[PDB]
Structure 1
Amino acid sequence: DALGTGNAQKQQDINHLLDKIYEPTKYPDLKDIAENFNPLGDTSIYNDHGAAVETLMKELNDHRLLEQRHWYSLFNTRQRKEALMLFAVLNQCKEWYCFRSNAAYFRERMNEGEFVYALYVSVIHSKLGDGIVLPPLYQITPHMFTNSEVIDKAYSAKMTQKPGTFNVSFTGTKKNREQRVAYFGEDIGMNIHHVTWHMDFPFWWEDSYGYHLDRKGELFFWVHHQLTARFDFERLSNWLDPVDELHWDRIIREGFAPLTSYKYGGEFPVRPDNIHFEDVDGVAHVHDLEITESRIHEAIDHGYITDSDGHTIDIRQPKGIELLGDIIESSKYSSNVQYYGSLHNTAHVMLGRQGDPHGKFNLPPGVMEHFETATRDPSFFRLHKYMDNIFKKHTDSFPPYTHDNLEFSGMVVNGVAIDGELITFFDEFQYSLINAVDSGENIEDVEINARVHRLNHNEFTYKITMSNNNDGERLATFRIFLCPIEDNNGITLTLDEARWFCIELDKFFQKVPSGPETIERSSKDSSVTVPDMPSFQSLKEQADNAVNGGHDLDLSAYERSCGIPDRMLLPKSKPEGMEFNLYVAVTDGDKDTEGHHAQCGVHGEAYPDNRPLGYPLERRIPDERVIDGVSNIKHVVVKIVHHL
């Protein structure tokens, strides 16, 4: 601080705080704070009169909080509770003086993951964290994102003090599996979004924390339907077939070995292939799921969710799908959590100890019991294919849309063109292995680096040619889906068979002139995308330079970023090329935003589009006859090519 603000301050403070995190801090101010401060002497800084502080001390006192240098999953009901207590202090600070103090005081005696986890969520949601950009998880705690080999290579770099970057690998016996569609799950970008997505709208949020995240519920429905489609496409491009939905009565056919290791903790357990699910002590019974899944499935089938009193709360209406998501992921918006439980989240802990359900070996938690690591394990997508059609069951009970339904009279797409080429290839990225190796003191830092291989495509532009027959200027929702065309059996599906498989590429609002415009728009301005983020270091360099320099840091570019990696914008496809189908449906802006970032409504911000999500492909479309004769929907085929 400046006995306050700056941001190149707030910012600095943060970088110091998550610097070498597996070891006591080396920045002196952080330490006399660390020593000298007492979160309990001027309950005033606190808008709670410090009930939150007072609760953590209580526990840090009876020393009943998890130990340092030990692992942590966010699926542990206690670890979570402890991590979230830090969030509630940092939360009720009136100003930087209370935050730095506490994340310093605490940083130094609470465990690292509870700490990493609390500092981030807090920075993301609390009032006080505007100016900041968080360093990328992959560089702050590299063990969750780099391999096991590169990690050991970095440990040696360090033992010997000779530096250098190592090239990472990809998982199983490439050319032996479906560690062929690996590039997708294993990417530090998607892994970043996956974790952020759930830090932006956490399953544990209560509206006591301050505001209400708006439609987490549909937002949950949708985000995962997207990774499940996005995933299903990559498997198309690899001669692989759409994924199996998981069942509790069957073998988990496809198991994997992650080759990843914890920092403190041991290597991630592995799963043998063609295994039978076991009842995992502590978490829940396998049948416990099977009944949960039926209570679920009866709410969809009935038309109503029934709460605790036996009140039936109707869901055959638009808020529908969000009360279903509150009961299915199970977040605290659940109406009856004692009855519908928690399919999704239990299903994550349940798939993770398949390595050790009675816990005879005391293996650590597993790749699925963590967000920066689940997309690694193949059953991750088998498990969301199953959540995915629990939702479609509801999703599909609506009656199809009428002509009169999709029509935004006046507007009509004339043509759709791609100004450029759809070309995807494989780039190269480098993140840093330093917070991973321990350097104590008087020993100096050798710069170790990891180099990964990630997908990419080339910027391209949309030229959407189109006339407003209306008398004059109307607001427009430009919706753009890229659905597939044939099967992988070769078969050629139907906009019913394929409406569900399509992934959203862009959604934006523009005004339309009163006559033939020709809107053009960029790979680069997509609304579902996010650039790669600034390096850890680089945000140190920068933070530092505006401290000794006066003031700024306006890199607002990054204080939310909900989306997926720009690199992942289009699917991989084949080197021969495939022709996908592009759908531009343009709906009516005035009714869409008929009421209101608002992209990552991280802080209470009402999501702006009111149409439900996947509009208008979210509904059974039995006769294509129709999508086809509304002026404001047009489809054109595109073709993507893969450079070797």
Structure 2
Amino acid sequence: TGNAQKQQDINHLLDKIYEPTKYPDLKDIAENFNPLGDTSIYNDHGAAVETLMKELNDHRLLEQRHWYSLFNTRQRKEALMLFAVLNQCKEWYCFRSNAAYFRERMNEGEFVYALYVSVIHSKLGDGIVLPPLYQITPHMFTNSEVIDKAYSAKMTQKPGTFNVSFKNREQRVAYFGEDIGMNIHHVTWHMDFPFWWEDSYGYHLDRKGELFFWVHHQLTARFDFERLSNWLDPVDELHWDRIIREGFAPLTSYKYGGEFPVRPDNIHFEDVDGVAHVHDLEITESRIHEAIDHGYITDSDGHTIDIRQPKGIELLGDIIE
């Protein structure tokens, strides 16, 4: 152990993530290790490990040098299996090993995501401070311009820092939304208290519900404030039966993936194949809005669970998010 060790290892793992590791130790590990030959390092007698492997083997896991969204029900599951290994390691010998072994044949997004969540929640990651996403995978936090300016630097082997950019809109209250600090927090908040947490993982995040209610209420408040300061008017509430008034162009790019799709202004909400129907929301919204109005949330049995009490708002945040 140590930390200036654990730490070191981490830094190495997340170094030039888009390419096979250059740190020799990480690679003989990456090669010689077998997550299945001492089912003892694992507190599960390695059921986790044996499940990743099985996938890695039938090679039914997402490819490397490809994008990844945490909203993709499969990409998530895969990402989250790495979490589950890293998670039941008794000591560092087992983490390093895996987050090396996998690091090299699992996709980067799943991987970056997996490592962070794992470091954050696993028993074994106390000493560590995680590098800032913004510098680990800069395509998600940097402009598309600066990105290309950086690819040029590199082509020519000439160094230096480029100035990023952001009178026509409400990309006047932009400084708020595009800040690398908020973006960090926004992701961290949901890494700290993930929507996918099962108390099987080890403990129980306390009031994730009210936490959820509140955190957004404040982005939402903080946001409303800035627009105040900009002669702008408080934000419109979004409806599924209306047009999406204010659309934008992000001018942002994926590393592997392409450029973030843009949305024109005054658009009509389309039924999106694979996710869900527009109407599917409308009804959800109704079911929600009826719990609130009745006084109770009704479970699967037709058991009405009361929410006209203090535990109220979290039970509500459990069903809303």
TM > 0.5 fold call? yes
From 230, 235, 240, the counterpart of 1:238: 230
Residues in 1 aligned to 2:165 and 2:187: alpha-carbon distance in whole angstroms: 22
List per-residue Cα deviations over 1:376-406 (Å, max 9, x = no partner). xxxxxxxxxxxxxxxxxxxxxxxxxxxxxxx
Higher relative contact order (CA 8 A, sep 6+): 1
List per-residue Cα deviations over 1:446-468 (Å, max 9, x = no partner). xxxxxxxxxxxxxxxxxxxxxxx
Residues in 1 aligned to 2:265 and 2:282: alpha-carbon distance in whole angstroms: 22
Instruction: Report the equivalent of 1:215.
Output: 207
Q: CA deviation at 1:298?
A: 0.0
Residues in 2 aligned to 1:197 and 1:231: alpha-carbon distance in whole angstroms: 17
Q: Helix, strand or coil: the match of 2:313?
A: helix
% of aligned pairs identical? Answer: 100
Whether 1:327 and 2:319 are equivalent positions in the alignment is yes
Instruction: Report the equivalent of 2:288.
Output: 296
Residues in 2 aligned to 1:266 and 1:101: alpha-carbon distance in whole angstroms: 33
Residues in 1 aligned to 2:188 and 2:260: alpha-carbon distance in whole angstroms: 22
Residues in 1 aligned to 2:162 and 2:317: alpha-carbon distance in whole angstroms: 42
Q: CA deviation at 1:140?
A: 0.1
Q: CA deviation at 1:308?
A: 0.1
List per-residue Cα deviations over 1:131-178 (Å, max 9, x = no partner). 0000000000000000000000000000000000000000xxxx0000
Q: CA deviation at 1:77?
A: 0.1
Q: Helix, strand or coil: the match of 1:222?
A: helix
TM-score (normalizing by structure 1): 0.50
List per-residue Cα deviations over 1:576-599 (Å, max 9, x = no partner). xxxxxxxxxxxxxxxxxxxxxxxx
Residues in 2 aligned to 1:306 and 1:121: alpha-carbon distance in whole angstroms: 32
Q: CA deviation at 1:237?
A: 0.1
Residues in 2 aligned to 1:185 and 1:134: alpha-carbon distance in whole angstroms: 22
- Aligned-CA RMSD value: 0.2
* Structure with greater proportional strand content: 1
Q: Helix, strand or coil: the match of 1:322?
A: helix
Q: Helix, strand or coil: the match of 2:80?
A: helix
> How many residues are matched?
320
List per-residue Cα deviations over 1:164-205 (Å, max 9, x = no partner). 0000000xxxx0000000000000000000000000000000
4+ runs of 1 displaced by more than 6 Å? Answer: none
Gaps in structure 1 of 5+ consecutive residues: 329-644
Q: CA deviation at 1:110?
A: 0.2
From 253, 265, 269, the counterpart of 2:261: 269
List per-residue Cα deviations over 1:304-337 (Å, max 9, x = no partner). 0000000000000000000000000xxxxxxxxx
Residues in 1 aligned to 2:57 and 2:119: alpha-carbon distance in whole angstroms: 25
Residues in 1 aligned to 2:191 and 2:125: alpha-carbon distance in whole angstroms: 14
List per-residue Cα deviations over 1:418-462 (Å, max 9, x = no partner). xxxxxxxxxxxxxxxxxxxxxxxxxxxxxxxxxxxxxxxxxxxxx
* Structure with greater proportional helix content: 2
Q: CA deviation at 1:48?
A: 0.1
TM-score (normalizing by structure 2): 1.00
Q: CA deviation at 1:225?
A: 0.1
List per-residue Cα deviations over 1:206-232 (Å, max 9, x = no partner). 000000000000000000000000000
Residues in 2 aligned to 1:100 and 1:112: alpha-carbon distance in whole angstroms: 16
Q: CA deviation at 1:13?
A: 0.1
Greater gyration radius: 1
From 24, 45, 53, the counterpart of 1:28: 24
Q: CA deviation at 1:277?
A: 0.1
Residues in 1 aligned to 2:41 and 2:49: alpha-carbon distance in whole angstroms: 11
